[PDB]
Amino acid sequence: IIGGEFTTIENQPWFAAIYRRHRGGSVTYVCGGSLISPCWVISATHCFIDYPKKEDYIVYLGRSRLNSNTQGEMKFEVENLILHKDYSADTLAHHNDIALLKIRSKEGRCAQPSRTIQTIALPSMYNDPQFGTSCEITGFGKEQSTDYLYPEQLKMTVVKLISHRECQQPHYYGSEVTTKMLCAADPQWKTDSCQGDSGGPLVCSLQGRMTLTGIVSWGRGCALKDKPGVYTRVSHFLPWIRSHTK
Numbered sequence: 001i002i003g004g005e006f007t008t009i010e011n012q013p014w015f016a017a018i019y020r021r022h023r024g025g026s027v028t029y030v031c032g033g034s035l036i037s038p039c040w041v042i043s044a045t046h047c048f049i050d051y052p053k054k055e056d057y058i059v060y061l062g063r064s065r066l067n068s069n070t071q072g073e074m075k076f077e078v079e080n081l082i083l084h085k086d087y088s089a090d091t092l093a094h095h096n097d098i099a100l101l102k103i104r105s106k107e108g109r110c111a112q113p114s115r116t117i118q119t120i121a122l123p124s125m126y127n128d129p130q131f132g133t134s135c136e137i138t139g140f141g142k143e144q145s146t147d148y149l150y151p152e153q154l155k156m157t158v159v160k161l162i163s164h165r166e167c168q169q170p171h172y173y174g175s176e177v178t179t180k181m182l183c184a185a186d187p188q189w190k191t192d193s194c195q196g197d198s199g200g201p202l203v204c205s206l207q208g209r210m211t212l213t214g215i216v217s218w219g220r221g222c223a224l225k226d227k228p229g230v231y232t233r234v235s236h237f238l239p240w241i242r243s244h245t246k
């Protein structure tokens with residue numbers, strides 16, 4: 001997250017922190033995710049496509065810091081790593097950039113909801129917020145495009161949704177951004193999601209309900225003028241989500 005504010009997990013309780021175990025035992029952060037039901041974390045396929053071994057992943061819930069065992073946090077392994085069959089990556093555009101991670105504790109249990117661990121409601125079909133709606137993003141991603149380290153403390157920011165027509169303008173992304181994708185950015189280009197925020201939530205309050213409207217997917221640079229963050233439009237994927245969680 002470029003700009004925005006440092007936060008804690010109690011303000012983003014659906015936020016999942018996903019890490020990967022390397023040969024030799026080193027653990028590195030991979031991507032964010034969102035808890036949609038006690039057993040299920042939703043994220044982005046691009047986070048995992050090059051390392052598709054479910055055994056390598058560690059998922060935390062109720063975790064506020066990159067290297068601190070937050071009080072009340074729960075640690076999980078991935079019982080099932082479901083990648084979208086039609087995922088593909090172009091120079092910028094990532095297609096069907098959605099993944100499901102079935103989570104299991106060492107005792108074989110799914111998440112236990114608490115003050116710091118909660119699910120995020122899925123959107124309704126054909127009912128996304130209007131362009132200009134303010135939405136929030138969360139993640140452990142870069143604070144600056146030139147950084148190689150990620151922030152130790154969890155961050156959040158607020159961005160505005162951009163219409164498909166504006167996002168398809170030539171100085172924006174042209175025909176590379178599709179109707180299955182949602183653009184969102186700061187009108188002043190000062191705050192944005194960045195590398196490391198992928199898989200994480202784009203949460204919109206719609207009709208008084210906090211909803212998982214999007215999943216951080218792709219973008220040209222970070223907080224760049226005319227280059228919004230591009231998010232997987234969760235409402236398009238409701239049939240795929242329902243079919244793969246059953």
Ligand SMILES: COc1ccc2ccc(C(=N)N)cc2c1OCCCBr
Pocket residue numbers: 144145146192193194195196198216217218219220221222223224227228229230
């Ligand atoms: C590999 O890097 C990623 C991967 C996913 C992203 C997703 C979104 C955005 C954004 N500009 N909101 C940037 C992203 C991003 O950063 C591009 C610049 C890398 Br310093």
